Design an enzyme around this catalytic site. Structure first.
Site, PDB file in Angstrom:
ATOM      1  N   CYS A 152       1.001  -0.886   0.304  1.00 43.04           N
ATOM      2  CA  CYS A 152       0.229   0.217   0.020  1.00 43.04           C
ATOM      3  C   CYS A 152       0.847   1.002   0.255  1.00 43.04           C
ATOM      4  CB  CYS A 152      -1.138  -0.289   1.351  1.00 43.04           C
ATOM      5  SG  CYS A 152      -1.364   1.839   1.519  1.00 43.04           S
TER       6      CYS A 152
ATOM      7  N   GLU B 168      -4.002   4.072 -10.805  1.00 48.45           N
ATOM      8  CA  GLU B 168      -4.515   2.100 -10.877  1.00 48.45           C
ATOM      9  C   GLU B 168      -6.094   2.434 -11.672  1.00 48.45           C
ATOM     10  OE1 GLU B 168      -5.609   1.464  -6.528  1.00 48.45           O
ATOM     11  OE2 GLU B 168      -4.890   3.008  -6.284  1.00 48.45           O
TER      12      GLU B 168
ATOM     13  N   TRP C 264      -9.570   6.084  -1.889  1.00 45.67           N
ATOM     14  CA  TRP C 264      -9.751   6.850  -2.425  1.00 45.67           C
ATOM     15  C   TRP C 264      -8.109   6.197  -3.319  1.00 45.67           C
ATOM     16  CZ3 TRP C 264      -8.444  10.135   1.984  1.00 45.67           C
ATOM     17  CH2 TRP C 264      -7.207  10.719   2.167  1.00 45.67           C
TER      18      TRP C 264
ATOM     19  N   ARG D  84      -0.121   4.576   2.913  1.00 41.07           N
ATOM     20  CA  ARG D  84       0.095   4.644   3.873  1.00 41.07           C
ATOM     21  C   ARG D  84       0.409   5.416   5.518  1.00 41.07           C
ATOM     22  NH1 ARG D  84       3.840  -0.529   5.061  1.00 41.07           N
ATOM     23  NH2 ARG D  84       4.530  -0.238   2.565  1.00 41.07           N
TER      24      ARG D  84
END
Ligand code: HEM
Ligand code: HEM
Ligand SMILES: Cc1cc(N)nc(C[C@H]2CNC[C@@H]2OCCNCCc2cccc(F)c2)c1
Ligand SMILES: Cc1cc(N)nc(C[C@H]2CNC[C@@H]2OCCNCCc2cccc(F)c2)c1
Ligand SMILES: C[C@H](O)[C@H](O)[C@H]1CNc2nc(N)[nH]c(=O)c2N1
Ligand SMILES: C[C@H](O)[C@H](O)[C@H]1CNc2nc(N)[nH]c(=O)c2N1
Ligand SMILES: [Zn+2]
Lengths: 403, 404
Positions: A107, A284, A279, A110
């Site tokens: 991730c 992506e 979000w 973070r």
């Protein structure tokens, strides 16, 4: 024993000491590195994970070694000894969820780990109630475009029964319809799940962007189908800052990335339904979702619209069209007042998180190949940053598909 | 499932198992506890077993395992070690071993070409001046006026108690980096130290951004000697853009021949401390890394200003847009000048074909995913979607300590 970690842009060095807290093996050995693989190939054990986690919680509230710490350890021991399991207090669950996000090496988001709304849904006894919780989660997290990180936690796994499960991989996903001509209308990543929805009685659309219904499963029951009311599902039409034709492509994406099929592990307890959302980072959607060849695969269409020369790799038509699509995603979200972060801003904030975690914890588990964005990798500072990858608990995990 | 790593391609859905990794005899930096794959840097008994293994590789490659000549060569090798502490390769064994070291390099995306490598044997070299002659011949042959050809030149191996043959430069062709009074760097900041070493050793320096460095060459137990490459030997490409007319006015250029010169070539326990090798560029190496890294030429901002982009905000993707044009400038300029170059799309497509070749031939292929995936447009290339297994096979190229 402690690995040296170097940044090659700036020449700075740190040492990861946090990795010694790892209790769980990953896939690598001294003979061979397998770090590029996507998926992984009794009372005594639970008791020790429970103690470690309770130690973590009391240390976090600075009450490490107090009487409340001591009595809570006894409560857990008393419960496991008698029942083979135990239950978390709400604030503990809140701490564990934030920590699982903090500990997630793939991730890049973070730096936000401490800001997470935790909905306790452990008093859920039916698929119907799961749906109500899920709907409130969506409404909360969406917040008319001003997105807010959230997790909802359904009842833990129990040895004497089947799991609570959300069959969908995300709360909001577009259907994929296999066609007679072997092509796929919509999102090819969601073919199997679309077919299951139909099997369980859904009337399917025929669009490229049909929001899928949810298949929700209470223990040892057939999954039940629930249609999300369209007013809950915020979507963004994709248009381009300068390219007027782009909007004609009829492209869109949903606002809320909400992963719904991972398992949340806290203090040896397992939460098999624990959907969480934040979000989007633009790549992506712009790069992976729309440009992957096994996804919407729009690169060529877009390049032809741009009148690029598609005959040859060396005109870099792919690279050119990819940038414009990512730009369209950024522009459209910003226009519709929906939270989004670009890959430059996100990786810069990730670098800051690494430094924050160095000071706080003596390191940060990070998976380089997932942290580095899928376009313009070396243009971002994370490319030049060495990273140590390893598993800390509380954690998020992959789990088998329930069918 | 088989007792070997399972390797998936996520674009295509196809699966292989790597059995080749079982041949690895050297440990990398990873353990079950932590993965360290993103880190850039990692007696007679030992030698003999590495030798025997290499000789077995050689004899298997010519389909003569178990044969008289194979057993005799083995006996020959241990007799030589028993009485000298080292041994020497036959010519054909060196050729085989060099190619194998390139084939085994986990970080090289160019390995489809591994079988086509001109191996220059320079194991008779006895002076720094002769190293220079050897290097000039390599450069001429490899450059071939722009129709580039892969090549390696192999100088004599490490000998016990005797000093090494070394090329101090990291590449045969590199640009100077001059530290300024304003703390900035003129030229390539990656080359500040070697530039400063060259001046210490008597090089009269330039004052440009693209001054070709001299070579610092070290024969055993001697101080290194300085050699200027005659400029007619060093092919360079001036950079221009196909449509953006002002790009040529930037005065950017790069050289043709990527020639790594400070790596150690290990074959059967033998260590060749000086064995420069060269191929041709992949365009991203120049356009993205050398020109756009903040710690290299760092030209992103200059180019984006020329393109009139909004450099005040990340979300304009100004960095991504300028980078693409710089990369296209590299391809176009090299194509115009008829100098061999390959783009990151064609390179990665042919690396996938190489992976397929090696699955059939050896049962896998050691590959370092973070290095194989290009630094722009990663997931647009097929290697992004390909799981990879990384491990060390011998023969190998190794990094070695800088000799100063
Ligand atoms: C707040 C904004 C967030 C951003 C921008 C963000 C960004 C990302 C990105 C880019 C990835 C890699 C995903 C991929 O490419 O497949 C990722 C993975 C992940 N994120 Fe975040 N994230 C955010 C919030 C969260 C939250 C709230 C949680 C949990 C509470 C979370 C947990 C995870 C986990 C467990 C993964 C790994 C999942 C996998 O392996 O597919 N993230 N995130
Ligand atoms: C034929 C054209 C070739 C191309 C396009 C090519 C391409 C590349 C690229 C892109 C890298 C990654 C390095 C980086 O970005 O920093 C690399 C690494 C490497 N290449 Fe190749 N290469 C070629 C020929 C060769 C030859 C002839 C050899 C040796 C016989 C070789 C040996 C290596 C080695 C040992 C590495 C890893 C060492 C390092 O640079 O860290 N390559 N190559
Ligand atoms: C919470 C959050 C915010 C955000 N911006 N982004 C995310 C990552 C998800 C959405 N964008 C891609 C990621 O999706 C998560 C699922 N991972 C896909 C890879 C995978 C996993 C398991 C099995 C498979 F077969 C394949 C999460
Ligand atoms: C033979 C050949 C052909 C080709 N196209 N490409 C190559 C790779 C070199 C050129 N383009 C980048 C690579 O240079 C290799 C040297 N750098 C390795 C990483 C490193 C380690 C230690 C210190 C450092 F500063 C850097 C070789
Ligand atoms: C095979 C490879 O590990 C796989 O394609 C990974 C690479 N890096 C990634 N990085 C992110 N953020 N998301 C991904 O889905 C992937 N996919
Ligand atoms: C930190 C990371 O390991 C390092 O920056 C690597 C990443 N991948 C790379 N890949 C290639 N081809 N060349 C490189 O120099 C690097 N640098
Ligand atoms: Zn590893």
């Amino acid at each position: 024993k402690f690995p040296r970690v170097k940044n090659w842009e700036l020449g700075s060095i740190t040492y990861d000491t946090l990795c010694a807290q790892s209790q769980q093996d990953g896939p690598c050995t001294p003979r061979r590195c397998l770090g590029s693989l996507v998926l992984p190939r009794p009372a005594e054990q639970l008791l020790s994970q429970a103690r470690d986690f309770i130690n973590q919680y009391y240390s976090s509230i600075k009450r490490s070694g107090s009487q409340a710490h001591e009595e809570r350890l006894q409560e857990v021991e008393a419960e496991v000894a008698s029942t083979g399991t135990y239950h978390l207090r709400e604030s503990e669950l809140v701490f564990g969820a934030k920590q699982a996000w903090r500990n997630a090496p793939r991730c890049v988001g973070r730096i936000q780990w401490g800001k997470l709304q935790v909905f306790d849904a452990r008093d859920c006894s039916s698929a119907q109630e799961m749906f109500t919780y899920i709907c409130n989660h969506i409404k909360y997290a969406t917040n008319r475009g001003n997105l807010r990180s959230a997790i909802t936690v359904f009842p833990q796994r129990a040895p004497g029964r089947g799991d609570f499960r959300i069959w969908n991989s995300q709360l909001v996903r577009y259907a994929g319809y296999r066609q007679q001509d072997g092509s796929v209308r919509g999102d090819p990543a969601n073919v199997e799940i679309t077919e299951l929805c139909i099997q369980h009685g859904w009337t399917p659309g025929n669009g490229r962007f049909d929001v899928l219904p949810l298949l929700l499963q209470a223990p040892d029951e057939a999954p039940e189908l629930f249609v999300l009311p369209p007013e809950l599902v915020l979507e963004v039409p994709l248009e381009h800052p300068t390219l007027e034709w782009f909007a004609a492509l009829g492209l869109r994406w949903y606002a809320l990335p909400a992963v719904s099929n991972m398992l949340l592990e806290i203090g040896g307890l397992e939460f098999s339904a624990a959907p969480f959302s934040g979000w989007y980072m633009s790549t992506e959607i712009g790069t992976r979702n729309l440009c992957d060849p096994h996804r919407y695969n729009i690169l060529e269409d877009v390049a032809v619209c741009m009148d690029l020369d598609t005959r040859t790799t060396s005109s870099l038509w792919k690279d050119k069209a990819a940038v414009e699509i990512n730009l369209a995603v950024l522009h459209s979200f910003q226009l519709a007042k929906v939270t989004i972060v670009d890959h430059h801003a996100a990786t810069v904030s990730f670098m800051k998180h690494l430094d924050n975690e160095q000071k706080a914890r003596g390191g940060c588990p990070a998976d380089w190949a997932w942290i580095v964005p899928p376009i313009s990798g070396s243009l971002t500072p994370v490319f030049h940053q060495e990273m140590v990858n390893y598993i800390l608990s509380p954690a998020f995990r992959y789990q088998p598909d329930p069918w």
